[PDB]
């Protein structure tokens, strides 16, 4: 499990990437769920990019 400070920094960067890929298809509250998931556990590139907008 990452140290809490690395999870902190990760959440902001991960939600930014998810929102940039998905645009309006990703509500910030749902991007936050993916950010929390992938900042406490290691995710794949494919999951990070597609989880908030599986129809692309």
């Amino acid at each position: 499990v990452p140290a809490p400070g690395e999870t902190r920094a990760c959440g902001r960067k991960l939600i930014s990437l998810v929102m940039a890929v998905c645009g309006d298809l990703c509500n910030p509250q749902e991007g936050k769920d993916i950010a929390t998931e992938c900042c406490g556990n290691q995710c794949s590139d494919d999951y990070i990019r597609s989880a908030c907008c599986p129809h692309h």
């Binding site: 990452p2 140290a3 400070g5 690395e6 920094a9 990760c10 960067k13 991960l14 930014s16 990437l17 940039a20 890929v21 290691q42 995710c43 794949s44 590139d45 990070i48 990019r49």
Partner: protein, 204 residues
């Protein structure tokens, strides 16, 4: 597949003369993008050069190389000569994109011996576990670089290399490397700092 997208665009503005002004743009890209700036179509900061060294280090690997890069353009003492069209251009070796704004100075004691600034940096870099990743910082002059992680100095060893250009190169990344790496640019007058972020993605 390569992709590039504006994340934070420029916006047009009527600005006061003689007060320091800063533009910022952020671009998402895979593979890693660089940013340069143009004023009335002429190059004023940055270049189209890419990280060829890391591509050699990742010979034979499946590469993720995605993330967001950021850049800032500072106009120290804006005057009428600075009015015009500013462009932030991203390039990743395959595609390009740009965001443009019109900046107009309104109005006419504006100032040497100052700290550097970090004008381009990796806001985030994602790369697959086991590959090499680079965290980029670039200054507005030749500088002395130090990198920090977890409030400790990053030392040069078999895994970490701090280059004279401002790159931190991290070989054989693992999940435990996820997190923030702060680049610190110094000259004889002071320092500038910026945070970068690395995410080693799962290798299935």
């Amino acid at each position: 597949p390569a992709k590039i997208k504006i994340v934070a665009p420029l916006e047009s503005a009527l600005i006061p003369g003689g007060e320091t002004y800063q533009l910022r743009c952020d671009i998402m890209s895979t593979p890693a993008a660089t940013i340069h700036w143009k004023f009335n179509g002429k190059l004023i900061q940055g270049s189209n050069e890419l990280n060829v060294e890391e591509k050699l280090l990742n010979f034979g690997k499946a590469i993720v190389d995605t993330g967001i890069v950021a850049s800032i353009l500072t106009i120290q003492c804006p005057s009428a000569e600075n009015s015009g069209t500013y462009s932030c251009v991203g390039y990743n070796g395959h595609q390009t994109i740009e965001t443009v704004a019109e900046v107009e100075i309104e109005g006419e004691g504006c100032r040497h011996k100052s700290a550097p600034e970090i004008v381009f940096w990796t806001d985030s870099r994602f790369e697959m576990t086991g590959n090499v990743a680079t965290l980029v910082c670039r200054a507005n002059q030749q500088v002395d670089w130090v990198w920090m992680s977890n409030d400790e100095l990053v030392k040069n060893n078999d895994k970490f290399t701090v280059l004279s250009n401002g790159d931190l190169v991290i070989k054989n990344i693992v999940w435990d490397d996820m997190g923030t790496y702060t680049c610190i640019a110094r000259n004889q007058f002071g320092e500038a700092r910026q945070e970068t972020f690395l995410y080693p993605t799962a290798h299935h």
